[PDB]
Write a protein that binds this DNA or RNA. Structure first.
Ligand SMILES: [Mg+2]
Ligand SMILES: [Zn+2]
Ligand SMILES: [Zn+2]
Ligand SMILES: [Zn+2]
Ligand SMILES: [Zn+2]
Lengths: 51, 115, 46, 404, 1131, 67, 206
RNA sequence: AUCGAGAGGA
């Protein structure tokens, strides 16, 4: 019913008046640790090769 | 862990432009100047000098995020004038004002030390 | 190679090899400290 | 990403957010979206979950995104509203005597995302061009929504007499065609209640426009508050000598009243009321006297406040605090209760060894006749600690039963 | 002669300082341990019975004397050397001293062939020693001597060092013993129950509880019963009285009812008599008791013997366990019945379970005594078996080999090391939470942990009554300091002048009462008890008296003269009920108070004069107590005391409140504890705020101890620039907060500036932080040891190599030396190696077992220590040093519950500034004040502005009428500032004035241990658990975050089924099984050869692949383990 | 543990004033007059000198690691 | 061997002001220097070598910071105010280090901030009403005020603008206060000149 | 590494 999961992060929260309500400000280390598996296509072949 | 180096507020990254001009399409004769690695120190003076130009209809600036190190200055002028020309004249006027202020402060210091 | 240690009680510089009980030769004290490395560590005065 | 805070009580405790990468090592949140999470920044931590497929990403983007989460099905009202600084500041900003200069107005218009680039005609053209705070909030307000509200300080006998549509106090919020025609905005107009501007924006305009409305209120109002400023200090906790004398006279009269009731009970001149024993009737009379004293002193303190008082500012806007807090800071802290009754005789017929036996007076049984600025006496301090311990125990013991 | 009011604030605090010069803050711990070593161990050894063993020759083996030497340590060569506590901390030794016992073995065979052989100083065990106790090597040492030994002179002691770990014994609350308590349970068969947990003076058995209850109404009337120990059936009280030799009903009611003119008591006891008339003689009553027992002897003889033994030993041991005590036991049981009837008749109040006069604090001494009794009994048992197996062969034996000293040593060591208070075998019946690891995060945390009390009611219990702040905690327990989590009200803290009594023998008091006109209980006739006053001593009714008033006067005079009655003896006269209860036992929390004459203090000005020159004429606190000017009053004697809050209460007033006071407070601020005594103006805050600060002063950074350079603590935070508060209370002078402060005075502005301080957050000055503002250093110690446990496998510190080591990570080992240990001064990043350890195998003949850094730390090695542990293999400790500069997300707090994280940091040009260019160090939001009502924060800010402008330290002592806000404002207006602490500030970005004048000034802020860098964590396909293939738990394990049941429910409400499946299936534990389409049970798949078959159905074609969580496969297999057939049917 | 170099607020140097401050205090100056003699006029720098606890003097009571 | 760890000493050395009057304009930023890590054109070498052999505590002060450049020295060491205290040493303790000083400003770190307070004020009498005192009588008068004591604030000036700004620039020691002001004006003017150069490139590139 | 206990945070 509940379990531990991958691709999760946790840290202290902080105010930021300059984010929209639907935005979350994320550290670069959390974002560098966490990844999203994006499928390659001719639409994104160049960008994904760059990455 | 996540602390940016303190020089990133002042130093331009390679391939990053100091200033970028983008035409504002909402109203005519308006431009957005995105200036990188500057802050309220130049934004406030440039804005306030632009407000002294009667051919300037709008002059404002913002630091979109304090953790980021750029400013955006929006300038709208009258149709016979240009926001780029207004921005240039504002910088020229600020430079002349500061040169005069520096020379007069040198004179005042000389008077104070002498008598 | 020598790995000279300092005594916690007598502050004596004495060499001790591996597979040797940790004993100061001057007073027999059982707690020893390593000396500061010779490597070059740099500090930004910030 | 899904952004979550524990305990995850309702569906608004896990909402979808768009990632914005920023320098330091904390999760940075907008301040309106803190009320749904029940989150404050006193060391709270939150969990970020990254969906790992286009299908889950589309699911979260079309179901759980924060703008889609503005109105809750629990109570058919907004779940997030305008909050502390932005609410105190929008209250101060939409007052009738807020006049902005040309440079200030341009500074604020820099922070409107939904601005058409047209400077509005100032409300005052001569002797000097001045815009009003309502005139700029009208630019913040989206679409052509129409809304009627009333500021918290709206007198109840104003809608009957004349001046109903021209309010002397600038209460009676009226937004027409997306312009704040009149009124001071506050919790009642921008909070999480039903029929507020944020609710009507979400119902008439979409969730995207409402998202921008939240963001624009926050940015514009915070950058104006950089000019106006908001604070609080000792001067806001102080009252004039007349108010202090009135409060002390009220407390002295109340203590004499309680002494009279005690003397009546001691002489058997007190007869019980239906449905209660004599002890309970005496307790009811004493508690009524002391509650009356507390309310009268609180009213005295409240009327003593100026328009510049920052407690009154935050209470009026609804940003934080209540009139009882002002009364306790200025007038009197009041009766301390343990299990809904006065301080019990924990010693033998005594609340403390500093009192005589069988002393049902107000100070013996836990009436704090001082304010927080005046400072509590040692017995008032201990009784107040007892009353506060009751709240701590309640907070720490209700959680297991409610969660189960 | 009299101390006038204008001098009082000095005099009282002078008195208070003298107290803390005499006692300290951990006096209860040291006195408890000292009494345990001086008295309790000897009493336990002597109270054990001599073990008489014989086949013939016989041996008694009587233990007669104990000797506890100083703490020593035995090396492998065996040389005893004096061991210092710091050496114990560094080497992971146990700071214990050897206990030797004198044994006397006399041979007695026949023919008067007697000869005694005495073994002087037989090593019986090792006892861990509390630091700074009398038997500690740091006892009586000067500060220079302690510094010579690398000890902090401010270290209070009061703790043990077990295996290098500092362990502190928490005082445990318990109901007092030998006292009758009449309660009434609403949901029970009994209307009223009078219990008495009885325990003999020198403990040898547990508390034997006896109950005397009344059956709830609905045969004819209310029957009184008695639930005796070791008997599983209620017994009528009349049966018990007859079993004690009182058969006549007149005698029984003489013992129960002392006033025969009272028919109410009579008719309420009559049902019990009517129920017991068939039994009318002692032997029959004893037979009835034995029959109702759980071991009913078939023959009435052994039934009667068992009943005799129960009624003589288990029933009311405190009254006396010898024979011929039936009269005293009958009188006491009659008193229990009398108390029950008084409660049932409404003539007495039910006793309050929460009254601290009814409680006792089980301190280090009496707790170690419980352990020592159990352990010495086990030791004597083992000696009995060992000696028996030898004398059965008819030959002598060596007691030195009979005494296996590991019982006492390992028992005390284990119990103090783990906290499980009891035998190691009974690890579940044992009660944990005793003996916790001493908190060394800040000096306040250490002091509070050493003054910590515990109510073992159980955190699971949701009844608020034991958690409530009782009235009787006044002066004994801090009203504020308590954890706000699940242990609200259960974990408590001593008030500053609170002293837990250590215990004393009632012998001199009883002897004086004998010499005085008291009449013993066996010599009187019951008819005298009516008008006379009972006298109880430690719960035992010892006699009666005729003039209780002048008896109390005599006893109070005796105690105030330091005569036969010692200071800690409590003497309560209940007047309405004529008892006089005297208590000398341990665990009674009490506090000192100023005695009051007719309406005057006995503390004259001469005492203050002699106290002022305390350092010359050696006139101390004890001379103040001996002068009869001060008195220790316990919670139970406070009920009979009339206190004056201040000597101003003793003034004659227009309407006198009392005019008959008996005592006075030394100062009311002493009701607070260690951490609440740091709050300035706590009487101007809401009490929850004071509790939250009392909890948060313990996470504040500072200098936790002066000798931190030599300690190898696992975690330690030291602030670069600790400051004493500008605004302080007069109690911190004794907490030593001025010598080891835990914060910095920050120019704080309460303002709304940019919105980055909203909702309990702060804006800090980046320029101040650059200048060392709230900078700290974090010290982390790693321990390692190379074990040569056997020739099969041995570990060793040596620089590993890629060619010989097998489990060698890709991280580089170049930072290590040939000894395998990194050197100090080497900068080490996350995942780096600090100790190169290799273990011999049964990548050949040695595997890598190196110690890495705790990941994502990035410190510098502070120092490396090498020594030998107790058994004597090489042992290393490496302290790594990491500078923590405050940043966004770090938690800060004032002393008023005002906590918050750093929202953003602005440079000095970006912060708002006053006309004189002062920028705030911190900006906090005004919205944190109104709901919280932390007016103490504002008054402290204003007082701090005055203090900084005046060059003084503000006095924020709680109850001080010489300091109010108007005085502080008038003072501040003299320094050219707005009297209310406001200033015109300018916007740092634009330089324009802020329309609203901001409230700014110095406030003492604290940096708390909770830094964001120790909390930030992320995961993307890391390690998984072995049992269920799900992410690990924790940052340290690189674990994943729990998507719990409530998250599942939230996403169900959202309707996000694919996200729910991603979180609960695909991001946790994806798995595949092969199922038989016929029986639905997991089949056998062989994907390499592609052969799938179900052994059950004997098919190999109808198999199906099923994608299920691994936890669900594990569940189904654990169900098949239970003979359940969960058949996953795919059709 | 040791007197800071700069004032945290303004950045004025206070590191060279601790010893002079102590010498003025033993010269029977009041703390306020001593702070006035050293030229600490802003209450931030007065905070720095007035609230400082010289812990280094206690850390120097322990013998060093090497003789 | 001192009781303060290495980063403590380093941080403490960074905050010692060094006389920068004529040398700061000549030195280059190490970013701009075409040398290796260091050279005399972009940096100044300091050496410190102290050992407490005597029985009294040795005060390692800024006077012990020995420089290779005579022009760039600790301010207190310049030829009264005592020397800044780096660390106190006990007999047998020793501190030997080698520092390099660089060119920077307060945006990067407060140690490169030359000011010990910048008092800035305008409109001492609240004539523009940029502040709104709830009780103007309660507030003290500015040192630059020109009002009789009965008058609390100046009459409101509707046509007024902020002019006449009052400054008190206090120097930490590195630069002279007038050198701070002159260098500030020059630096602001060069910021604007560089901005105008980049502006011209952006305008002409379009 | 596991298990337990304890201390904490929200
Ligand atoms: Mg929180
Ligand atoms: Zn040695
Ligand atoms: Zn099958
Ligand atoms: Zn300063
Ligand atoms: Zn160079």
């Amino acid at each position: 019913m509940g379990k531990r999961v991958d691709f999760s992060a946790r840290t202290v929260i902080t105010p930021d008046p300059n984010l929209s309500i639907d935005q979350v400000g994320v550290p670069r280390s959390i974002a560098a640790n966490m990844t999203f598996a994006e499928i390659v296509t001719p639409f994104n072949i160049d960008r994904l090769q760059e990455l | 862990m996540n602390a940016p180096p303190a020089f990133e507020s002042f130093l331009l990254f390679e391939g990053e432009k100091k200033i970028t001009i983008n035409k504002d399409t909402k109203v005519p004769n308006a431009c957005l100047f995105t200036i990188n690695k500057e802050d309220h120190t130049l934004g406030n003076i440039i804005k306030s000098q632009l407000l002294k130009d009667p051919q300037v209809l709008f002059a404002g600036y913002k630091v979109p995020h304090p953790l980021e190190h750029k400013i955006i200055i929006r300038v709208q002028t009258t149709p016979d004038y240009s926001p780029q020309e207004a921005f240039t004249n504002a910088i020229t006027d600020l430079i002349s004002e500061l040169s005069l202020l520096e020379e007069r402060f040198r004179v005042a210091i000389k008077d104070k030390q002498e008598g | 190679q020598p790995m000279i240690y300092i005594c916690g009680e007598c502050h004596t510089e004495n060499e001790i090899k591996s597979r040797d009980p940790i004993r100061c030769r001057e007073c027999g004290y059982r707690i020893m400290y390593k000396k500061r490395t010779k490597r070059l560590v740099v500090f930004d005065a910030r | 990403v899904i952004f979550n805070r524990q305990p995850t009580l309702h569906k608004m405790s896990m909402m979808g957010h768009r990632v914005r990468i920023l320098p330091w090592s904390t999760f940075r949140l907008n301040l309106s979206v803190t009320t749904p999470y029940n989150a404050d920044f006193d060391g709270d931590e939150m969990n970020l979950h990254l969906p790992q497929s286009l299908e889950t990403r589309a699911e979260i983007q079309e179901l759980a995104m924060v703008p889609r989460m503005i109105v809750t099905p629990q109570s058919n009202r907004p779940v997030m509203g305008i909050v502390q600084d932005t609410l105190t500041a929008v209250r101060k900003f939409t007052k009738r005597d807020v006049f902005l200069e040309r440079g200030e107005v341009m500074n604020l218009l820099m922070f409107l995302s939904t601005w058409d680039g047209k400077v509005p005609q100032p409300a005052i053209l001569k002797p000097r061009p001045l815009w009003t705070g309502k005139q700029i909030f009208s630019l913040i307000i989206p679409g052509h929504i129409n809304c009627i509200r009333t500021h918290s300080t709206h007198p109840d006998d104003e809608d009957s007499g004349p001046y109903k549509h021209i309010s002397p106090g600038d209460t009676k919020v009226v937004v027409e065609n997306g312009e704040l025609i009149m009124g001071i905005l506050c919790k009642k107009s921008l909070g999480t209640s039903a029929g507020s501007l944020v609710h009507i924006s979400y119902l008439e305009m979409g969730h995207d426009i409402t998202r921008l409305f939240y963001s624009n209120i926050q940015t514009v109002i915070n950058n104006w508050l950089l000019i106006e400023g908001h604070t609080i200090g000792i001067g806001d906790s102080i009252a004039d000598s007349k108010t202090y004398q009135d409060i002390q006279n009220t407390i002295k009269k109340a203590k004499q009243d309680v002494i009279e009731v005690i003397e009546k009970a001691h002489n058997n001149e007190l007869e019980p009321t239906p449905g209660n024993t004599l002890r309970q009737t005496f307790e009811n009379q004493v508690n009524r006297i002391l509650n009356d004293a507390r309310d009268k002193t609180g009213s005295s303190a409240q009327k003593s406040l100026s328009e510049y008082n920052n407690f009154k500012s935050m209470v009026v806007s609804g940003a934080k605090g209540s009139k009882i807090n002002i009364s306790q800071v200025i007038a009197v802290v009041g009766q301390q209760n343990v299990e809904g009754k006065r301080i019990p005789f924990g010693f033998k017929h005594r609340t403390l060894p500093h009192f005589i036996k069988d002393d049902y007076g107000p100070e013996s049984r836990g009436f704090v006749e001082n304010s927080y600025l005046a400072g509590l006496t040692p017995t008032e301090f201990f009784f107040h600690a007892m009353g506060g311990r009751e709240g701590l125990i309640d907070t720490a013991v209700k959680t297991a039963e409610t969660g189960y | 002669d009299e101390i006038t009011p204008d001098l009082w604030q000095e005099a009282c605090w002078i008195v208070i300082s003298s107290y803390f010069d005499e006692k300290g803050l951990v006096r209860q711990q040291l006195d408890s341990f000292d009494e345990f070593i001086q008295m309790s161990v000897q009493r336990i050894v002597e109270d054990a019975p001599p073990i008489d063993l014989q086949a013939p020759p016989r041996y008694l083996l009587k233990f007669e004397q104990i000797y506890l030497s100083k703490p020593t340590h035995w090396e492998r060569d065996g040389a005893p050397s004096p061991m210092m506590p710091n050496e114990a901390r560094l080497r992971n030794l146990t700071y214990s001293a050897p206990l030797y016992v004198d044994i006397t073995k006399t041979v007695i065979k026949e023919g008067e062939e007697q000869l005694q052989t005495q073994h002087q100083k037989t090593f019986i065990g090792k006892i861990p020693i509390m630091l700074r106790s009398t038997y500690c090597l740091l006892n009586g040492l000067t500060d220079r001597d302690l510094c010579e030994l690398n000890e902090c002179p401010l270290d209070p002691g009061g703790y043990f060092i077990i295996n290098g770990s500092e362990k502190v014994l928490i005082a445990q609350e318990k109901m007092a013993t030998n006292t009758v308590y009449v309660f009434a349970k609403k949901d029970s068969k009994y209307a009223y129950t009078g219990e008495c947990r009885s325990c003999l003076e020198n403990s040898s058995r547990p508390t034997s509880t006896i109950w005397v209850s009344m059956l709830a109404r609905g045969a004819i009337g209310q029957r009184i019963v008695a639930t005796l120990p070791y008997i599983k059936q209620e017994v009528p009280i009349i049966i018990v009285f007859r079993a004690l030799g009182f058969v006549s009903d007149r005698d029984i009611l003489e013992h129960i009812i002392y006033d025969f003119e009272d028919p109410e008591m009579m008719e309420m006891v009559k049902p019990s008599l009517d129920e017991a008339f068939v039994i009318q003689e002692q032997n029959v009553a004893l037979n009835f008791i034995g029959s109702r027992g759980a071991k009913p002897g078939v023959t009435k003889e052994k039934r009667i013997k068992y009943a005799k033994e129960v009624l003589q030993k288990e029933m009311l041991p405190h009254v006396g366990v010898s024979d011929f005590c039936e009269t005293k036991k009958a009188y006491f049981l009659g008193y229990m019945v009398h108390r029950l009837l008084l409660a049932a008749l409404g003539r007495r109040e039910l006793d309050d379970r929460d009254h601290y006069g009814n409680k006792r604090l089980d301190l280090a001494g009496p707790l170690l005594a419980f352990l020592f009794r159990g352990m010495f009994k086990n030791l004597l048992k083992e000696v009995r078996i060992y000696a028996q197996k030898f004398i059965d062969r008819g030959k002598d034996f060596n007691l030195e080999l009979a005494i296996k000293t590991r019982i006492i040593s390992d028992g005390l060591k284990y119990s103090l090391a783990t906290g499980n208070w009891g035998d190691q075998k009974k690890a579940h019946q044992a009660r944990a939470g005793v003996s916790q690891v001493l908190n060394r995060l800040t000096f306040a945390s250490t002091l509070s942990h050493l003054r910590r009390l515990n109510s073992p009611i159980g955190r699971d219990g949701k009844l608020a009554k034991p958690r409530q702040l009782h009235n009787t905690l006044w002066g004994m327990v801090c009203p504020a300091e308590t954890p706000e989590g699940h242990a609200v009200g259960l974990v408590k803290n001593l008030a500053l002048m609170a002293y837990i009594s250590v215990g004393s023998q009632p012998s001199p008091i009883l002897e004086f009462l004998e010499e005085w006109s008291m009449e013993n209980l066996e010599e009187i006739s019951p008819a005298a008890i009516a008008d006379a006053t009972k006298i109880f001593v430690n719960g035992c009714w010892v006699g009666i008296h005729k003039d209780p008033e002048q008896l109390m006067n005599t006893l109070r005079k005796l105690r105030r003269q330091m005569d036969i009655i010692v200071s800690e003896v409590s003497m309560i006269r209940d007047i309405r009920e004529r008892e006089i209860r005297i208590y000398t036992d341990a665990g009674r929390i009490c506090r000192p108070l100023l005695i009051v004459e007719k309406q005057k203090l006995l503390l004259k000005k001469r005492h203050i004069d002699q106290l002022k020159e305390r350092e010359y004429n050696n006139y101390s606190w004890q001379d103040l107590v001996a002068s009869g000017v001060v008195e220790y009053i316990d919670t139970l004697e406070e009920e009979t005391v009339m206190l004056a809050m201040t000597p101003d209460d003793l003034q004659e007033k227009e309407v006198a409140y009392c005019s008959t006071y008996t005592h006075c407070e030394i100062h009311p601020s002493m009701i607070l504890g260690v951490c609440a005594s740091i709050i300035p103006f706590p009487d101007h805050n809401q009490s929850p705020r004071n509790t939250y600060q009392s909890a948060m002063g313990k996470q504040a950074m500072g200098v936790y101890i002066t000798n931190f350079h030599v300690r190898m603590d696992t975690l330690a935070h030291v602030l670069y620039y600790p400051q004493k508060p500008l605004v302080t209370t007069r109690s911190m002078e004794y907490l030593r907060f001025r010598e080891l402060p835990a914060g910095i005075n920050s120019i704080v502005a309460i303002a709304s500036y940019t919105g980055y301080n909203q909702e309990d957050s702060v804006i800090m000055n980046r320029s101040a932080v650059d200048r060392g503002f709230f900078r700290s250093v974090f010290y982390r110690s790693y321990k390692e040891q190379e074990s040569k446990k056997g020739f099969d496998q041995e570990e060793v510190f040596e620089k590993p190599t890629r060619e010989t080591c097998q489990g060698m990570r890709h991280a580089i080992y170049d930072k290590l030396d040939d000894d395998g240990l990194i050197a100090p001064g080497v900068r080490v990043s996350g995942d780096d190696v600090i100790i190169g350890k290799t273990v011999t195998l049964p990548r050949y003949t040695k595997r890598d077992c190196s110690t890495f850094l705790r990941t994502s730390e990035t410190g510098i090695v502070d120092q490396v220590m090498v020594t030998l542990n107790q058994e004597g293999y090489k042992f290393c400790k490496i302290r790594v040093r990491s500078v923590r500069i405050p940043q966004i997300g770090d938690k800060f707090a004032s002393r008023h519950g005002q906590k918050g994280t750093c929202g953003i940091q602005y440079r000095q040009e970006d912060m708002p500034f006053t006309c004189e260019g002062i920028t705030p160090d911190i900006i906090i939001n005004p919205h944190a004040i109104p709901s919280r009502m932390t007016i103490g924060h504002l008054i402290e800010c204003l007082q701090g502005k005055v203090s900084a402008n005046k060059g003084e330290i503000g006095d924020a002592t709680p109850f001080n009428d010489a300091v109010n806000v108007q005085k502080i404002s008038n003072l501040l207006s003299d320094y050219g500032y707005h009297l209310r602490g406001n200033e015109v500030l300018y916007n740092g970005f634009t330089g324009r004035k802020i329309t609203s004048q901001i409230f700014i000034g110095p406030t003492y802020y604290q940096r708390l241990k909770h830094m964001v860098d120790d909390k930030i964590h992320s995961r993307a396909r890391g390690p998984i658990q072995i049992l269920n293939r799900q992410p690990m738990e924790g940052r340290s394990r690189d674990g994943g975050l729990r998507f719990g049941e409530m998250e599942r429910d939230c996403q169900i409400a959202h309707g996000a089924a694919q996200f729910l499946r991603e979180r609960l299936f695909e991001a946790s534990d994806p798995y595949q099984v092969h199922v038989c389409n016929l029986c639905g049970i997991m089949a056998i798949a062989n994907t390499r050869t592609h052969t799938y078959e179900c052994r059950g159905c004997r098919n190999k074609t109808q198999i199906s692949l099923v994608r299920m969580p691994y936890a669900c496969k594990l569940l189904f297999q654990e169900l098949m383990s239970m003979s359940i057939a969960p058949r996953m049917m795919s059709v | 543990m040791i007197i800071p170099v700069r004032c945290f607020t303004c950045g004025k140097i206070v590191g060279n004033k601790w010893e002079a401050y102590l010498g003025l205090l033993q010269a029977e100056y009041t703390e306020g007059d001593a702070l006035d003699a050293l030229g600490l006029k802003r209450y931030c720098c007065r905070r720095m000198l007035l609230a400082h606890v010289d812990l280094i003097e206690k850390l120097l009571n322990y013998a060093p690691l090497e003789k | 061997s001192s009781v303060l760890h290495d980063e403590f000493i380093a941080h403490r050395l960074g905050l010692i002001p060094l006389t920068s009057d004529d040398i700061v304009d000549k030195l280059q930023y190490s970013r701009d220097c075409t040398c290796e890590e260091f050279c005399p054109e972009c940096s100044v070498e300091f050496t410190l070598d102290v050992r407490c052999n005597e029985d009294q505590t040795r005060h390692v002060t800024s006077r012990d910071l020995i420089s290779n450049s005579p022009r760039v020295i600790p301010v207190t060491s310049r030829n009264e105010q005592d020397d800044i205290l780096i660390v106190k040493l006990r007999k047998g303790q020793e501190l030997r280090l080698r520092a390099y000083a660089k060119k920077g400003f307060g945006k990067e770190h407060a140690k490169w901030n030359p000011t010990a307070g910048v008092a800035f004020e305008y409109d001492p009498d609240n004539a523009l009403r940029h502040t709104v005192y709830p009780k103007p009588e309660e507030w003290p008068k500015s040192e630059y005020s020109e009002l009789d004591e009965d008058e609390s604030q100046a009459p409101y000036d509707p046509n007024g603008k902020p002019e006449r700004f009052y400054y008190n620039v206090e120097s930490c020691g590195s630069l002279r206060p007038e050198t701070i002001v002159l260098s500030a004006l020059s630096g602001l003017k060069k910021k604007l000149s560089d901005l105008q150069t980049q502006l011209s490139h952006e305008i002409q590139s379009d």
